[PDB]
């Protein structure tokens, strides 16, 4: 995954970190200004869980594949 991580709203999450587990997806999420990125867990793409953990009610998200896929602009708009 080795994802960009921003547990707090960050309109351009550039915080790449070496959570460098290999096989697993990242998360990107845009909730308007409330944009989030995480060293997420694979085997997931559940809107209810994302809303829970990220505490967001209108969010749009991708569980993008494997490594470094999850930079902040991958969600358009």
């Amino acid at each position: 995954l080795q994802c960009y991580n921003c547990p707090n709203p960050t309109a351009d999450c550039k915080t790449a970190v070496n959570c460098s587990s290999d096989f697993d997806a990242c998360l990107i999420t845009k909730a308007g200004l409330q944009v989030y990125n995480k060293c997420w867990k694979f085997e997931h793409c559940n809107f209810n869980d994302v809303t829970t953990r990220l505490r967001e009610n209108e969010l749009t998200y991708y569980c993008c594949k494997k490594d470094l896929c999850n930079f902040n602009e991958q969600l358009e708009n």
């Binding site: 793409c45 559940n46 809107f47 209810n48």
Partner: protein
């Protein structure tokens, strides 16, 4: 006092009122594309 009654009075009143209203709405759209 011009008139009255000697005696005792016991008055006990209990009122309990509880109301709980919950409404939960959700809509989602979730999509795949893989090969």
């Amino acid at each position: 006092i011009t008139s009255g009654s000697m005696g005792g009075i016991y008055e006990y009143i209990l009122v309990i009122d509880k109301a709980k209203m919950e409404s939960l709405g959700i809509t989602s759209r979730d999509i795949t594309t893989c090969f």
